[PDB]
UniProtKB/Swiss-Prot annotation, chain B:
It comes from the Eukaryota. Disulfide bonds: none annotated. This is Chromatin structure-remodeling complex protein RSC3. Present with 1750 molecules/cell in log phase SD medium. Forms a heteromer with RSC30. Interacts with LDB7 and NPL6. Component of the two forms of the RSC complex composed of at least either RSC1 or RSC2, and ARP7, ARP9, LDB7, NPL6, RSC3, RSC30, RSC4, RSC58, RSC6, RSC8, RSC9, SFH1, STH1, HTL1 and probably RTT102. The complexes interact with histone and histone variant components of centromeric chromatin. Component of a fungal-specific module (HTL1-LDB7-NPL6-RSC3-RSC30) within the RSC complex. The gene is RSC3. It comes from Saccharomyces cerevisiae (strain ATCC 204508 / S288c). Component of the chromatin structure-remodeling complex (RSC), which is involved in transcription regulation and nucleosome positioning. RSC is responsible for the transfer of a histone octamer from a nucleosome core particle to naked DNA. The reaction requires ATP and involves an activated RSC-nucleosome intermediate. Remodeling reaction also involves DNA translocation, DNA twist and conformational change.
Swiss-Prot record, chain D:
Present with 3380 molecules/cell in log phase SD medium. Component of the chromatin structure-remodeling complex (RSC), which is involved in transcription regulation and nucleosome positioning. RSC is responsible for the transfer of a histone octamer from a nucleosome core particle to naked DNA. The reaction requires ATP and involves an activated RSC-nucleosome intermediate. Remodeling reaction also involves DNA translocation, DNA twist and conformational change. This is Chromatin structure-remodeling complex protein RSC8. The chain holds residues 305 to 355 of 557 of the full protein. It is found in: Nucleus.
From Swiss-Prot, chain E:
It is found in: Nucleus. It holds the Pfam family SNF5. GO terms for molecular function: nucleosome binding; transcription coregulator activity. Keywords: Cell cycle, Chromatin regulator, Nucleus, Phosphoprotein, Transcription, Transcription regulation. Phosphorylated in the G1 phase. PANTHER family: SNF5 (PTHR10019). Interacts directly with STH1. Component of the two forms of the RSC complex composed of at least either RSC1 or RSC2, and ARP7, ARP9, LDB7, NPL6, RSC3, RSC30, RSC4, RSC58, RSC6, RSC8, RSC9, SFH1, STH1, HTL1 and probably RTT102. The complexes interact with histone and histone variant components of centromeric chromatin. This is Chromatin structure-remodeling complex subunit SFH1. It comes from the Eukaryota.
Curated annotation (Swiss-Prot), chain G:
Transmembrane segments: none annotated. It comes from the Eukaryota. Interacts directly with SFH1, CSE4, histones H3, H4 and H2B, and via its N-terminus, with RSC8. Interacts with LDB7, NPL6 and RTT102. Component of the two forms of the RSC complex composed of at least either RSC1 or RSC2, and ARP7, ARP9, LDB7, NPL6, RSC3, RSC30, RSC4, RSC58, RSC6, RSC8, RSC9, SFH1, STH1, HTL1 and probably RTT102. The complexes interact with histone and histone variant components of centromeric chromatin. The gene is STH1. Belongs to the SNF2/RAD54 helicase family. This is Nuclear protein STH1/NPS1. The chain holds residues 253 to 297 of 1359 of the full protein. Catalytic component of the chromatin structure-remodeling complex (RSC), which is involved in transcription regulation and nucleosome positioning. RSC is responsible for the transfer of a histone octamer from a nucleosome core particle to naked DNA. The reaction requires ATP and involves an activated RSC-nucleosome intermediate. Remodeling reaction also involves DNA translocation, DNA twist and conformational change. It is found in: Nucleus. Present with 1990 molecules/cell in log phase SD medium.
Length: 194, 42, 178, 51, 246, 60, 45, 118, 136
């Protein structure tokens, strides 16, 4: 008689949003792989659900994948990725990049990304590393085996820069974003990038 | 504040290609297949 | 004597085993936990025992009431464990015992609301294998021996598939060969 | 015969023909095939036997 | 199918008010439980035990409730009579910790009692906010100079009164009184319910010897009574603990 | 410059590319019409374990 | 009859081929392509 | 005289009496207890195998087999040396021990305590 | 002068391991002086080294009266007039070096009452697509 009044909304375990949230919170990389695959699916299909305005404690959960990627860009001048595990942390940083790229076109999750003063320093580091190649600098001679990892990486960086450029509309005189991008504009042959 | 709400219909297609032109015809039928079922609720 | 003391230890280890009759379901994210050792997720979530700030907050006394809550939940799995049933038996402050009980309920290690009759089953790891947890000899069931590294398998158990592993069926369906 | 058979994945010709009768009978409903074998065989084993 | 759910049974308030289980919270083979006996993987065999189908028939379905450099331990007594039955227990309180409010604890406490009357939650916490504020600077002392007092201790648990006598030095903090409470229960063979109650009745005894040191400032470190074997050489101990059944 | 961390990279990646190119071999015409895919291939383990999942969704 | 089931078995376990097979979902070209199809559109102004 | 023997024999009789008080009620009379707050059979921890070592992986003998063999096993090192822990002593304490073989004897029992894993 | 007749009359023979060969039944040396130094460096008017001497001699000699019984802390507290914060310090120290609880009956060591150990239990996972077993 006590096993007929079960609540139907919780008879399946926990819900999928917490199941993705506890997956990144755990150290399980396949659950991290699964939840990031679900987060990118939900970013492309329903950005109102995982907006930073709705979920405020979603921004550091992606920062711990993208902030350790700066070393991989620093080591990208040579054959660095010998294993399938440093490749895996590289893919998790690139996966968390596109979820923040897809959620930066919502206009309520963008200012919260603007007020973070750490993504813009990461953006500047990627642009400065791209300024080694866009000028052709022998400083950080990009390894030719690591160019494809860097091509799609700077494609989503420009999309983040395109969305937050109106919030740094008080541009400075020596604006490092303005200075690098006019050096980048003298280099590419992509119609989309121009 | 908790609200146990139903999630949105996410267009997850069985065969998974990589070029976009094999997705839009099934996605346009998905948009017809989802908004018409959503219009009658209003 | 030696095989007799090995058989005497094995009989009294069978006498105190707490044989399993209910399966235990944990969520897929909370598989980082082990009974013997303290995980680093617990050392960053309840650090007051590991900071050694007060004398009443040690990693030993954390680990004791950690395993006490789970062992009193795993032996009565279908019953929702409460805080007041735990607080009357353990000697800690009310603030820290709420911290660990909420931490174990947040990860779903205790009090996991689920009905397993509405979910399918899988065969993830390999079929074959002689899966043995390696226990230690309980000090008290050791022989007297007034004056020998004998390991003994307590419970052998075969499972024709994972479906009888999840239902804890030990091919006892030959009796109920329906 | 009406008695319960041996340990599974043996698939005697009584179990094989009663499987073969049901697919000629029903063409689906592997619940209705598994009891027609005798009910001591799982749904997950008859399809694993048929393929 | 044929699987029991992992939750939705909280038959605890009925065992709080079962009148055979020795619970001092409320007033108004041959084993009992198969925690050493297998059942050959048939769940109907657990219905033969009388305290288990008691939880299947008289049980309920619950919803799960969802939620500093030195701890100051203050034992808090809670004595509230409430519609015939009373509420009688004891618990320490980390006064330095404020992570849980006493109103949050009282809403937690009256849920496992299955009361949830919402005025017990006020009346429990108002007593807790009383007894924390009355003892806020009496358990934070800094006692030196080797007071070395003797301590008689009594513990009341369902007419099974425990009593001991020992010399306690409340100058070295090497021996935790909870650890001292555990060493008696391990050696005497008592149940786990005496682990909190001996420690909770010793911290109150400690803050009473702390009291006479800070309130009246009576030192009175004059011959803690011994039996001429250890500290004070008279001729070259006091007592031993016991659980008296009155 | 570095003979170490491009040959360890080579011995891993050429092993990885040997895995990826050897991921498509059990899907020929007369390789599936015979029964050396389903029978005794628990060393394979790849298919005939999904029948506990594909039947649970009605895929047959 | 078993041909139709084996048609429905092979074309259900192999039509994905990159969500369960680990060395294929940990390849560079597949993980980039599964990322590339999930790129949401850029909004103009 | 007859003070030091009479107190210590009373201590050994009380140690004998307290052992006879704790061994009967827990293990011999009803072989356990029962908690009042939760339906859990209480038990002494001395007969419970408190730690657990790693797993041991194997295979079943026949190929193309589906049988899962989950089991358990006890383990100890020689079952005769007790666990008087010298590993809970820092390495600086026993360095003014008067001998050198005792420094070996402390550390060997420490290494005996450190091979709890198999 | 008092323990000489007591050690001669009713004491069972001494069992002592190899790692406690530094131990001196007569006096103190640097191991006991650095392990529990509160009995030496004037922690009180009470904890003299002579009171440390009488208690460490009473503790080891009562175990000579019952070597196959665990000489517990509470039983020696019946006839030791010391702080219980100081009785535990010696009794854990001599047990640490295997003096007073080395070769006993393993079942007369007192252990706390409590629940059973669930480590050999079979756990299944709430995978988001099934209930696969937990088999490492």
């Amino acid at each position: 008689n006590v096993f007929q009044s079960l609540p139907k909304e919780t008879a399946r375990g926990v819900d999928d949003l917490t199941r993705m949230e506890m997956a990144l919170l755990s150290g399980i990389p396949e659950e991290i792989k699964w939840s990031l695959k679900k987060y990118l699916t939900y970013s492309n299909k329903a950005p109102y659900m995982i907006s930073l305005r709705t979920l405020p404690d979603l921004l550091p959960l992606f920062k711990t994948f993208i902030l350790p990627l700066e070393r991989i860009v620093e080591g990208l001048n040579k054959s660095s990725i010998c294993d399938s595990k440093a490749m895996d942390s590289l893919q998790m940083g690139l996966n968390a990049l596109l979820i923040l790229r897809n959620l930066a076109q919502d206009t309520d999750s963008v200012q919260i990304l603007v007020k973070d003063r750490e993504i813009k320093s990461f953006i500047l580091f990627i642009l400065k590393k791209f300024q080694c190649v866009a000028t052709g600098d022998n400083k950080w001679q990009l390894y030719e085996g690591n160019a494809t990892f860097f091509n799609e990486l700077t494609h989503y960086t420009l999309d983040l820069m395109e969305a937050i450029s109106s919030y740094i509309a008080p541009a400075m005189k020596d604006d490092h974003y303005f200075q690098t991008l006019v050096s980048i504009l003298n280099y590419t042959k992509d119609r989309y990038m121009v | 504040p908790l609200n146990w709400v139903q999630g949105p219909a996410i267009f997850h297609m069985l065969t998974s290609p990589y070029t976009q032109d094999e997705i839009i015809n099934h996605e346009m039928n998905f948009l017809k297949g989802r908004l018409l079922e959503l219009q009658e609720i209003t | 004597n030696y095989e007799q003391e090995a058989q005497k230890l094995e009989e009294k280890a069978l006498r105190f085993l707490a044989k399993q009759t209910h399966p235990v379901i944990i969520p897929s994210f909370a598989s980082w936990f082990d009974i013997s050792k303290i995980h680093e997720i617990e050392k960053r979530s309840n650090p007051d025992f590991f900071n050694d700030s007060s004398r009443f907050k040690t990693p030993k006394a954390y680990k004791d009431t950690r395993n006490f809550i789970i062992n009193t939940y795993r032996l009565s799995p279908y019953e929702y464990l409460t805080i007041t049933a735990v607080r009357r038996n353990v000697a800690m402050d009310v603030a820290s015992i709420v911290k660990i009980h909420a931490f174990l309920e947040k990860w779903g290690l205790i009090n996991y609301q689920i009905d397993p009759r509405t979910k399918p089953s899988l065969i993830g790891p390999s079929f074959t294998g002689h899966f043995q947890v390696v226990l230690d000899t309980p000090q008290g069931l050791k022989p007297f021996l007034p004056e020998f590294p004998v390991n003994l398998t307590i419970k052998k158990n075969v499972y024709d598939s994972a479906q009888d592993f999840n239902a804890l069926q030990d091919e006892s369906r030959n009796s109920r060969q329906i | 015969e009406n008695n319960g058979n041996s340990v599974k994945k043996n698939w005697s010709d009584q179990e094989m023909l009663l499987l073969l009768e049901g697919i000629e009978m029903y063409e689906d409903q592997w619940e209705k095939i598994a009891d027609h074998v005798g009910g001591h065989k799982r749904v997950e084993d008859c399809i694993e036997k048929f393929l | 199918n044929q699987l029991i759910p992992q939750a939705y049974i909280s038959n605890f308030h009925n065992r709080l008010t079962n009148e055979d289980d020795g619970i001092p919270i409320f007033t108004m083979g041959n084993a009992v439980l198969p925690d050493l006996q297998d059942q050959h993987h048939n769940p109907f065999n657990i219905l033969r035990y009388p305290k288990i189908r008691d939880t299947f028939i008289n049980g309920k379905v619950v919803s799960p409730y969802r939620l500093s450099g030195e701890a100051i331990m203050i034992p808090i007594t809670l004595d509230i009579e409430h519609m015939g039955h009373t509420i009688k227990d004891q618990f320490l309180w980390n006064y330095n910790d404020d992570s849980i409010s006493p109103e949050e604890f009282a809403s937690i406490y009256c849920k496992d009692l299955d009361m949830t009357s919402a005025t017990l939650q006020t009346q429990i916490a108002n007593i807790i906010k009383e007894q924390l504020k009355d003892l806020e600077n009496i358990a934070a002392t800094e006692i030196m100079s080797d007071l070395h007092v003797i301590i008689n201790l009594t513990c009341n648990l369902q007419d099974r009164f425990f009593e001991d006598n020992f010399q306690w030095n409340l100058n070295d903090k090497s021996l935790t009184p909870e650890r001292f409470a555990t060493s008696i229960v391990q050696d005497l063979g008592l149940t786990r319910e005496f682990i909190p109650l001996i420690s909770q009745s010793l911290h109150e005894t400690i803050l009473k010897i702390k009291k006479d040191w800070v309130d009246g400032h009576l030192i009175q470190d004059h011959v803690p009574n011994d039996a001429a074997f250890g500290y004070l050489s008279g001729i070259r101990s006091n007592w031993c603990p016991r659980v008296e059944i009155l | 410059l570095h003979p170490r961390e491009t040959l360890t990279h080579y011995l891993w990646s050429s092993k990885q590319n040997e895995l990826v190119l050897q991921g498509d071999q059990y899907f020929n015409e007369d390789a599936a019409r015979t029964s050396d895919i389903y029978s005794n291939n628990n060393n394979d383990r790849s298919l005939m374990g999904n029948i506990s999942l594909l039947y649970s969704q009605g895929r047959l | 009859k078993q041909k139709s089931i084996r048609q429905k078995l092979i074309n259900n376990v192999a039509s994905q081929a990159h969500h369960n097979i680990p060395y294929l979902r940990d390849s560079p070209f597949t993980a980039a392509a599964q990322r590339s199809v999930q790129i949401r559109s850029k909004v103009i102004v | 005289t007859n003070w030091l023997y009479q107190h210590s024999a009373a201590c050994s009789r009380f140690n004998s009496d307290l052992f006879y008080d704790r061994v009967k009620v827990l293990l011999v009379d009803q072989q356990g207890l029962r908690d009042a707050y939760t339906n859990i059979l209480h038990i002494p921890e001395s007969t419970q195998s408190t730690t657990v070592l790693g797993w041991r992986r194997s295979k079943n003998d026949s190929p193309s087999d589906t049988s899962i063999v989950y089991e358990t096993v006890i383990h100890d090192n020689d079952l005769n040396k007790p666990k008087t822990g010298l590993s809970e002593i820092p390495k600086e304490i026993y360095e003014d021990v008067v001998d050198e073989d005792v420094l070996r004897a402390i550390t060997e029992q420490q290494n005996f305590e450190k091979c709890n894993e198999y």
